[PDB]
Amino acid sequence: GPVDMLKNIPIPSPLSPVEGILIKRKTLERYFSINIFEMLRIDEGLRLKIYKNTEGYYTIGIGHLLTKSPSLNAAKSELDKAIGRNTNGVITKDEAEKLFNQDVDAAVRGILRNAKLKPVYDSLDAVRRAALINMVFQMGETGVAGFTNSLRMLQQKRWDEAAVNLAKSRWYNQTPNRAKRVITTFRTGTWDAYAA
């Protein structure tokens, strides 16, 4: 939903707001604050013309796999089904953000139907929820639910233990750069791996 797309300002606790409500701009300049659009754009890229990913299949926008079918037609038939206008394999930026908002919404409602992921998701702050959504983007709901022991350490706020354990994974071995960014996000609960 709309609340999942919000910019997150990862100020630690406690906040010292002026008279309980006002945080000054000068205090906020110290913090690097983004939304999950900006995060998955960094990990997956933003492309407005159909391309083939590393995998390598037909994809579009921010990590949106169209087909595993090698036919550009039908890759175009599902892109077109997705936007609702006849794109000749070419979308706008708005359509990309629309397609992204739909893909995140599907990811979160997937997490919430999963008996393993929901309790962990429910326990996390919004920045670490983004990290969990990131992993669901990369490898699917079922694939993320396979991180049994890390998920349990995340739930118990054993951040350093979870980060050590996530580093022992295939995920980390295969896509180290992105894995390290996501693990940094779990360890610290900030967007700092995304400052570049």
Binding region for other proteins (CB under 8 A) out of 4-12, 53-61, 161-169, 170-178: 4-12
In whole angstroms, the minimum distance from the beta carbon of 171 to other proteins comes to 26
Report the SS3 class of residue 84: coil
Binding region for other proteins (CB under 8 A) out of 14-22, 57-65, 74-82, 142-150: 14-22
- 112 lies in the binding site for other proteins (CB under 8 A): no
Within 84-103, which residues bind other proteins (CB under 8 A)? 98, 101
Buried b (16+ CB within 10 A) or exposed e, 145-180: bebeebbbbbeeeebebbbebbeeeebbeebeebbe
**C-beta of residue 109 within 8 angstroms of C-beta of residue 101:** no
Report residue 92 as tokens.
């706008």
In whole angstroms, the minimum distance from the beta carbon of 58 to other proteins comes to 26
Site map for other proteins, 132-161, x if CB under 8 A?
A: ------------------------------
* Cβ nearer to other proteins, comparing 26 with 115: 26
Element (H, E) at 150: helix 148-155
* Cβ nearer to other proteins, comparing 10 with 110: 10
Q: Of the candidates 16, 22, 54, 55, which one interacts with other proteins according to CB under 8 A?
A: 22
Q: What angle do CA 177, 69, 49 make, to 5 degrees?
A: 60
Binding region for other proteins (CB under 8 A) out of 20-28, 53-61, 155-163, 177-185: 20-28
* Cβ nearer to other proteins, comparing 12 with 54: 12
- 55 lies in the binding site for other proteins (CB under 8 A): no
**Residue 90: which of 66, 68, 110 has the closest Cα?**
66
What distance lies between CA 154 and its chain's CA centroid? 16
**Residue 141: which of 119, 112, 168 has the closest Cα?**
112
Where do contacts with other proteins occur on this chain (CB under 8 A)?
1-3, 5-13, 15, 17-25, 28, 33, 98, 101, 125-126
